[PDB]
Structure formats: C-alpha cells, structure tokens
Amino acid sequence: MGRDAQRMNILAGRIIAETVRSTLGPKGMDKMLVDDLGDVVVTNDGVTILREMSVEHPAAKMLIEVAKTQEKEVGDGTTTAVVVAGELLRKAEELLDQNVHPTIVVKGYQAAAQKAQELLKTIACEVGAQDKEILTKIAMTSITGKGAEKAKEKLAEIIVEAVSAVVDDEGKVDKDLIKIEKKSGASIDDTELIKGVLVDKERVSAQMPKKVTDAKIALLNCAIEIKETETDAEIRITDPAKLMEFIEQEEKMLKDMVAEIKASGANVLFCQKGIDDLAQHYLAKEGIVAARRVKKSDMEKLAKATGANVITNIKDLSAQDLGDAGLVEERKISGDSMIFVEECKHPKAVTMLIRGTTEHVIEEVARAVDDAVGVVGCTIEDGRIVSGGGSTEVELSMKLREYAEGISGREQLAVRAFADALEVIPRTLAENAGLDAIEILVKVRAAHASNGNKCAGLNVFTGAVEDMCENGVVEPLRVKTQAIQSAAESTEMLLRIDDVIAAEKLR
C-alpha cells in the first residue's frame, strides 16, 4: 500500500513533466494542439501547454497550479522549473529502491536549496542605472524561441528606449500599462512606437477635419442626448404648438452648448456612446474634433496622461475639467483606421504596434513583448545579472559536490542527487542540435575546474565553447532563483502523500 500508490503518483507526474521538455531551447520543436470541434493550434512556449492539458489525474494538477503562481511573477522561469522538478522526481524515484523511505531526501533538498541560493548571490556583479549598452542584450536575448528570423535587431532597440523613461528616475515603483493590439497588415514585420494615445475605432461619416494644432481634449460621458435614460415624473401636452416649440428649443440648445465648450477652451470631443449625424455640422463650423465610441480601456489612459476629469451630466462642465493635447490625426494604416493623439503632457505609458502578414505572426509577437519587458523591470531594481546560457547550474554542480563532503549520514546522497539533477539544462539545450550529443557536457564540465573561467557556457549558434557575456546572453538571477524555489516546493508535495483515499462528501 505504501509502495503501490507512491510509484503511480510519480509515473503520472513524469508523463506531464517530460511533455514540455522539447519546448525549452531557442530552436526547439513546437506543439500541435487539437480540440473536439476541430481547432488546430500551434504553441511554442510551455505556459500554454500546461493550461490546455487533460488534468483528469490528481497528480497532474498540483504542479500546474504551482507553476501558474510562479508564471505570474516574472514570466520567464516556467518551463525550466517543470523540467527541473521532473528531473528531481526521476532521480528520487531510483533512490527509493534501497528502502530508505522518503524523509531524508526532503531534508537534503531543503539543505541544498539554501546553499544554492547563497552561492547564486555570490556569482553575480553590480549593474548600476547609468548603463545603456548592457540593458539591450537582455532584451535581444529575450526573443529567441518566438521568432529570431525577424526579431533580433529591430525589436532590440525600441524596447529599451521605451522602458527607460520612469524607471531610471524612480528605481522602485514603475507599474505601467502596456497594451498590445493584435492587427494585421501587408508588410513583413513593422514595429511602431506611439508616444501618445492610440484609439482603435473608425467612423462612418468622414465630414470632420483631422488636423488641429494645440487642441484640447475634453472628456464627456453620457447625459448629453435628448433620450438616453428614463424619467419618473411624467409630463402632459396641452397645445400642439408647444411640443414643437420645446423640440426646437432643445435642438437649438446644442448650439449654445457647443459654443460654451468652445469658449471654455476645448477642441476634442470624446464621448462614450455614438454621436448623431445631425450634431456633426455644429462641430464643423467651429473646428472641433468629433469622435464617438470610446472604450473604457482607452478612456482610462486620458486622466493620467493629458490631465482631465469626467462629467456625469452636461451642465457640470466649467473650465478646470479640461485637458491638453498636441496633434490628433486619423490615418488609414494597415487596413483599419486608428486615431493617433501625439504630444500629451505626462508620457507615462507607451503603445507598441506590430504589423505582420497573416494573423498568426502578430499573435506570435503578442506572447513575446510581455516576456521582453518583464526581464527589464527586474533588472534596474535588482542588478544581480549572472551568466546565462546554462552556466550557473554547471557552476553550482561543481560546488555542491565538494560541499556535501563535509557532512556524514544518509543526507549526502540527497545533496549529490540534487547536484547531479542540475545537469539536465545543458543536456536539454544541446539535444536540439546534432553535433552536440554528450561531448559538449563533458567539455564544459572540466573547463570550470581551474580558478576563474565562469562566464563560459554554451551557444547553439556556433558549436564550440566560449564566453556568454560577450555574445549577448545576460539572463537575470531572479528568474533562476524563483524557478529553483518552485522546483523545490513542487517536489515535496508528491513524496509526502504515500497513500491516497476517497470520499463522497464535498470539500
């Protein structure tokens, strides 16, 4: 009973752990996912694989739940954490044949995790905020498995210039709002960096100007038209010449309503609903930008950038509830028509537009930008950049072997197993090639046996061995520490189960 239900839980986890094994290197194979209706999709990363997966077995759920909590942190060390956890489980499964029972292995892993975390903090350097040439290599190496055939130089010079705006001034809080729009076009790969406001909404009546200098943005909500809500106090009619007079008065009231806004100092009208065609001419004889259908996601970016308040009615508008803009234009680019408002006041956030050919290419960039800025915000606030490319694990493996010699007991085999399991990263990064096999792992192991030589690792774009800091791979340390912590926490939630029962009571 103790050994029957224990091996099944490990066998059920090793199947889902080795699924994202091939999707780890920069030049690895993709995954084809089909559905019952007939939706064939292609996924190259490992985050989407863990979501759309048959979680019918209880063992194939806790690991995914743990990985989802770690992916929402930095979003980079998700697949490697699952690979390390699977390697640890496979290494610990063989150690159960000596009849020692799972207990000392957990203590050994807990003792080795602290040593690894202490050693990782001593193999890094100090990166200040006055650098610039160092902050671009991390952005260049962040886009490898997504699509290096078009994103390797153009997408590495516009992210650093866009993020470095409020992070260098305040190195603590830099929570921005970055929105990526999924739209196609006709070009190969075009990247636009809008330094203003982007509105994704067209019109139907092209009878309004689209070039106003130093215009002012005025945010107006509802309660503007004649009928939009309801009225509890009902009215009555007496003479037929009174209703027509009231209608004419309510129609002419719009003239003075627009004149008041013009005299207050505003030339841009942003309404939540739609603007009637009869209210356009009144906005054309005065030079006021007419717009309609403003999404809340696009409207919330106007109060913190231009500087204006909202009006719940129509008679609550004065002079302090106005903003300031630069140039509002409506160009037809990439098929659809979008509104560009340039020169605001406080350039906090930024907008990035990607134009490709079909429809699956732009989406491929949608999962690449969010994973490219996340490695930047954790760089200025920290600065403990280590040597990426599978060099930290090999360096820690040479130290754990000599550190485990100072202790005596059955806990040394656990530390040795944890140290040997760290060599799975170079084996997976070299399996995608053909001229690597196993000689690369032997050559990179005896190279770090001297005094120095630490930045050397492995690159799949050459074949030989060289330094990683001189090429352009500078993976941070947080993405490794969080991955190691997740792997050490997930490997203990399965060995401490042993038996499994069932019940008919909810919760």
Ligand X SMILES: Nc1ncnc2c1ncn2[C@@H]1O[C@H](COP(=O)(O)OP(=O)(O)OP(=O)(O)O)[C@@H](O)[C@H]1O
- Binding-residue pattern over the window 396 to 435 for ligand X, x denoting contact by CB under 6 A: ---------------------------------x------
> Least distance from C-beta 408 to its own copies, angstroms?
6
Contacts of 94 (CB under 8 A, 6+ apart): none
Q: Which window, 79-87, 262-270, 298-306, 407-415, contacts its own copies (CB under 8 A)?
A: 407-415
The alpha carbon of residue 277 and the mean position of all alpha carbons in its chain are separated, in whole angstroms, by: 41
Give the residue among 418, 465, 419, 462 at the shortest CA–CA distance from 441. Answer: 465
Token pair of 484, please? 């190691």
- Binding-residue pattern over the window 352 to 391 for its own copies, x denoting contact by CB under 8 A: ----------------------------------------
Applying CB under 6 A, does 389 fall inside the site for ligand X?
yes
Q: How far is CA 65 from CA 24, 46, 50, 225, 387, in A?
A: 20, 14, 9, 50, 30
Q: Rounded to an integer, what distance in angstroms lies between the CA atom of residue 93 and that of residue 41?
A: 35
Applying CB under 6 A, does 136 fall inside the site for ligand X?
no
> Least distance from C-beta 429 to ligand X, angstroms?
6
Applying CB under 6 A, does 388 fall inside the site for ligand X?
yes
Residue from 9, 136, 144, 491 that binds ligand X (CB under 6 A)?
A: 144
Token pair of 15, please? 């199947």
Contact 220, 323 (CB under 8 A): no
Applying CB under 6 A, does 387 fall inside the site for ligand X?
no
The alpha carbon of residue 27 and the mean position of all alpha carbons in its chain are separated, in whole angstroms, by: 21
Contact 332, 171 (CB under 8 A): no
Q: Which window, 48-56, 229-237, 247-255, 409-417, contacts its own copies (CB under 8 A)?
A: 409-417
Applying CB under 8 A, does 432 fall inside the site for its own copies?
no
Binders of its own copies among residues 438 to 477 (CB under 8 A) are 438-439, 442-443, 446, 449
Beta bridge partners of 42: 32
Residue from 79, 397, 482, 490 that binds ligand X (CB under 6 A)?
A: 79
> Least distance from C-beta 378 to ligand X, angstroms?
14
Instruction: Please choose which of ligand X, its own copies, none residue 76 contacts, taking the beta carbon within 5 to 8 angstroms, the exact cut-off set by kind.
Output: ligand X
Q: Rounded to an integer, what distance in angstroms lies between the CA atom of residue 115 and that of residue 110?
A: 9
What is the size of the binding site for ligand X (CB under 6 A)?
23
Q: Among this protein's residues, is 78 annotated catalytic?
A: yes
Q: 3-class DSSP state for residue 467?
A: strand
Q: What is the DSSP string of 363-407?
A: HHHHHHHHHHHHHHHHHHTT-----TTT-HHHHHHHHHHHHGGG-
Residues that bind its own copies (CB under 8 A): 98, 100, 405, 408-410, 412-413, 438-439, 442-443, 446, 449
The residues assigned a catalytic role are 45, 78-79, 371
Sites of contact with ligand X (CB under 6 A): 24-26, 45-47, 76-80, 141, 144-145, 388-389, 429, 458-461, 473, 475
